[PDB]
Amino acid sequence: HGLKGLNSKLLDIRSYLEKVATGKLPINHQIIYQLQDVFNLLPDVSLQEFVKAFYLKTNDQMVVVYLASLIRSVVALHNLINNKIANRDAEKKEG
Amino acid sequence: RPANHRQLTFEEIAKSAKITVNEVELLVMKALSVGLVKGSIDEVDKRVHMTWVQPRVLDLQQIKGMKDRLEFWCTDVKSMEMLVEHQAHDILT
Amino acid sequence: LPAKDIQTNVYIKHPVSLEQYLMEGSYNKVFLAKGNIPAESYTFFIDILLDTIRDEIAGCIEKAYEKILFTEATRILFFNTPKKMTDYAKKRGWVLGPNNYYSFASQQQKPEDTTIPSTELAKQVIEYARQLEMIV
Amino acid sequence: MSEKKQPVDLGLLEEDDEFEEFPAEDWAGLDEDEDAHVWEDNWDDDNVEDDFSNQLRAELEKHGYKMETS
Amino acid sequence: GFKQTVHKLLIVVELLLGEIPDRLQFRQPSLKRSLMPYFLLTQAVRTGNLAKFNQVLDQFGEKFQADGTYTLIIRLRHNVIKTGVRMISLSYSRISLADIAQKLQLDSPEDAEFIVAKAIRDGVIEASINHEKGYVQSKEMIDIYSTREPQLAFHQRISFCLDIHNMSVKAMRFPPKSYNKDL
Amino acid sequence: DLYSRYKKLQQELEFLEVQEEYIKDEQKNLKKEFLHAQEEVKRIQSIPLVIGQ
Numbered sequence: 001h002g003l004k005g006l007n008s009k010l011l012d013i014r015s016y017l018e019k020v021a022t023g024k025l026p027i028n029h030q031i032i033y034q035l036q037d038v039f040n041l042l043p044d045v046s047l048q049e050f051v052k053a054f055y056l057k058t059n060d061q062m063v064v065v066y067l068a069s070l071i072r073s074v075v076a077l078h079n080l081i082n083n084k085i086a087n088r089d090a091e092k093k094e095g
Numbered sequence: 096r097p098a099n100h101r102q103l104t105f106e107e108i109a110k111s112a113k114i115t116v117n118e119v120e121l122l123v124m125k126a127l128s129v130g131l132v133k134g135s136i137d138e139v140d141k142r143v144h145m146t147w148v149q150p151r152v153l154d155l156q157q158i159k160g161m162k163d164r165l166e167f168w169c170t171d172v173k174s175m176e177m178l179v180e181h182q183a184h185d186i187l188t
Numbered sequence: 189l190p191a192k193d194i195q196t197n198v199y200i201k202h203p204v205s206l207e208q209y210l211m212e213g214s215y216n217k218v219f220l221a222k223g224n225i226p227a228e229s230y231t232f233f234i235d236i237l238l239d240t241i242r243d244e245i246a247g248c249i250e251k252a253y254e255k256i257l258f259t260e261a262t263r264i265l266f267f268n269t270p271k272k273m274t275d276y277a278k279k280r281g282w283v284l285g286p287n288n289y290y291s292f293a294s295q296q297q298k299p300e301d302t303t304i305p306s307t308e309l310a311k312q313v314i315e316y317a318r319q320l321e322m323i324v
Numbered sequence: 325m326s327e328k329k330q331p332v333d334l335g336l337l338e339e340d341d342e343f344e345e346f347p348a349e350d351w352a353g354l355d356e357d358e359d360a361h362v363w364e365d366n367w368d369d370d371n372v373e374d375d376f377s378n379q380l381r382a383e384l385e386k387h388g389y390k391m392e393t394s
Numbered sequence: 395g396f397k398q399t400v401h402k403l404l405i406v407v408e409l410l411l412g413e414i415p416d417r418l419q420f421r422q423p424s425l426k427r428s429l430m431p432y433f434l435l436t437q438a439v440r441t442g443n444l445a446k447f448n449q450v451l452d453q454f455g456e457k458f459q460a461d462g463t464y465t466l467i468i469r470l471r472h473n474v475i476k477t478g479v480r481m482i483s484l485s486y487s488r489i490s491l492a493d494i495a496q497k498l499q500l501d502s503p504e505d506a507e508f509i510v511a512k513a514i515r516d517g518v519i520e521a522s523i524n525h526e527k528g529y530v531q532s533k534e535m536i537d538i539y540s541t542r543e544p545q546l547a548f549h550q551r552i553s554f555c556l557d558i559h560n561m562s563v564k565a566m567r568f569p570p571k572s573y574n575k576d577l
Numbered sequence: 578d579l580y581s582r583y584k585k586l587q588q589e590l591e592f593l594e595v596q597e598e599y600i601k602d603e604q605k606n607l608k609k610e611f612l613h614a615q616e617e618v619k620r621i622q623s624i625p626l627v628i629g630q
Contacts, residue, residue, distance in 0.1 A: 002176030009169055017162055033150055036161050041147060043098040047302045054302060055544045058552070065552060069559040076566035083573035090577070175307075179314065186318045190463040208472050213512040214505060248515045257525045263504060305545060312553060319560050323567070324605045329396045336395065339427060347430060364418045374437050
C-alpha cells in the first residue's frame with residue numbers, strides 16, 4: 001500500500017511542483033488553495049488527546065493477546081496428548 | 096503559523112485591532128457569524144484557538160513551505176514504505 | 189571472615205559494625221564514636237574512609253528531589269569551613285539563592301510524542317507476523 | 325540427581341529427634357481448631373491474632389470507656 | 395522434602411523487602427516443622443520492635459543463627475528499622491516528632507529526617523522533600539499507571555508476554571514434529 | 578572409505594539440505610490451494626434452493 005500511494009503522490013507532486021514555477025495558461029489555481037488547505041487541516045496533532053485512544057486500541061490488542069495465548073493453549077491439548085499416547089503405545093505395541 | 100502551537104490568545108487580536116478586551120467576544124462571535132471560520136475554543140483562561148480557513152488570495156511562503164512539508168511527508172511515507180517493506184517482503188512476501 | 193578466631197576484640201567487630209552503620213547510613217553515631225577507637229594507629233585511616241565516603245553521604249543528602257533548606261545543611265554537613273560550598277559550586281554547578289539551595293531539572297522531562305513507540309510497535313507487529321507465520 | 329535429598333532428610337530426622345512428638349501434639353492443640361480450615365485465611369487471622377496477642381487483643385470492650393475519654 | 399531450602403532461603407530473602415509472604419497454598423508437614431522456630435521472628439519482622447525482638451532472636455535462636463556467619467540475620471538486626479520505615483512509607487505522609495517518632499523507637503529531630511532521607515535515597519519509594527515551617531512532608535504518590543502513560547507502562551508487558559507465549563507456541567509446534575517424526 | 582565418508586557424506590548434506598526450502602514451498606503453497614479449493618467448494622453452496630424432507 002505504501003508503494004500504491006508512493007507512486008501516485010510521487011508521480012503527481014513532481015509535475016505539480018514543476019507547473020508551480022513553470023506554469024501559465026491558468027490551471028485553476030483557485031483549487032490549489034483548497035488543496036494546501038486540506039493538506040494543512042492536519043497540522044501534526046500533538047497526540048495528547050489520542051493517548052487514551054491508544055490505550056483503547058492497545059487494550060483490544062491485549063484482548064487479542066489473551067485470545068491467541070488461551071485459544072492456542074487449548075489447541076495444544078490434542079497435540080501434546082496424542083504425541084505421548086500415540087508414540088508410547090505404538091512403540092510398546094510395535095514388537 | 097500552520098503548526099508549532101497554533102493556539103493563541105486575545106492579546107494579539109486586541110493588539111492588532113486596537114480594541115478592548117470586552118469587545119473581543121463580539122468580534123469572534125461575528126467571525127463565527129460570517130461563516131468563514133469554524134473555530135470553537137474550549138479555553139478557561141482567555142485563549143484563541145482557530146480552525147479551517149481559506150487564504151483565497153495568495154501565499155508564496157506557503158508555496159515554498161508547502162514544498163518543504165510536502166516533500167517531508169513524501170520522503171517520510173517513502174521511508175516507512177522502504178523500512179516496513181524491506182524486511183516485510185523478505186519474511187512474508 | 190566470621191571464623192570464630194577471637195570475636196572479643198573491638199577491631200574484629202569494628203569493620204562489620206562500621207559497615208552495618210554504613211548500611212544504616214547514620215553518620216552521627218560514627219562522628220560521636222570517633223573517640224571510641226583505642227590507641228590503635230588506624231584512626232587516621234578511618235578518617236581516610238570518612239574522607240572517601242563523605243562524597244557519597246554529602247552527595248546523597250544533597251540529592252534535592254524538590255528542595256532543601258540551609259538550616260538542615262548546617263547540622264548535617266561538616267564544620268563552618270566553606271569547603272563544601274566552594275568545591276560543590278564547581279562540582280555540582282547549581283544556582284545559589286538567598287541562603288537556600290534550589291533544585292532544578294526535577295521531573296521536568298516532557299513525555300514522548302507517541303510517534304516513535306508507534307513505529308516500534310509496527311516493527312513488533314512485523315515480528316508478530318514473522319514468528320507467528322514463519323514456518324507456515 | 326535426586327541423591328542430594330538424603331542428607332537433607334537426615335537433617336529432618338535430626339529435627340524430628342530433637343523433640344519426640346512434642347510439636348505435633350503441642351501444635352496439634354491449635355491444629356485441632358485449625359484442621360480442615362482454609363490455611364490461606366489462617367495467614368491473615370494468624371497475622372492479626374499474633375499481632376494482638378501481646379496487647380489489645382479484643383479492644384472492643386474498651387471502646388465503651390474510650391468514647392467519653394477520647 | 396527438598397524445596398524447604400529454596401523456600402526457606404526464599405522467604406528469608408523476601409522478608410528483607412518488608413513484605414514477607416508466609417506458607418499459604420502449600421500443605422506438607424515438612425515446611426511447617428522447618429518454619430516453626432522461624433515463625434515467631436518472621437512474624438515479628440512486620441511489627442518491628444527493636445529491643446524486644448533483638449533479645450527474642452538470640453533468646454531461643456539455635457539453628458537459624460547456628461547456620462553460619464550470621465550474615466543475613468546480622469543485617470536483619472538493623473534491617474528491622476528499614477522495613478519498619480518502609481511500612482511508614484506505606485503509611486501516612488506527615489511525620490510527627492512525638493507520635494510516630496516515639497512509635498518508631500526513635501525520638502530525635504536529626505536522625506528522623508536523616509534516616510528517612512536514607513530511605514528516600516534508595517529509589518524504591520516516592521516522596522516530596524519540602525521544608526516550610528520545619529515539618530517534613532511527602533507526596534507518597536503510589537498511584538498505579540492506570541490512566542498514567544499506559545502504553546509505555548505495559549508495552550514491555552505486551553512484548554514480553556507475547557514473546558513467552560509465542561515461544562510457547564513454538565513449544566506446541568515442535569513436539570508435534572517430534573510426534574510425527576517416526577510416522 | 579574411512580576418510581572418504583566425510584566428503585562423500587557432504588553430498589547427502591547438500592541433498593537433504595536442499596529439501597528445506599522445497600518443503601517450505603510445498604507447505605506454503607498447498608495450503609493456499611487448500612483455501613482456494615475450500616472457497617471454491619464453499620461458494621457452490623448457494624442460498625436459492627428447494628426444501629425437501
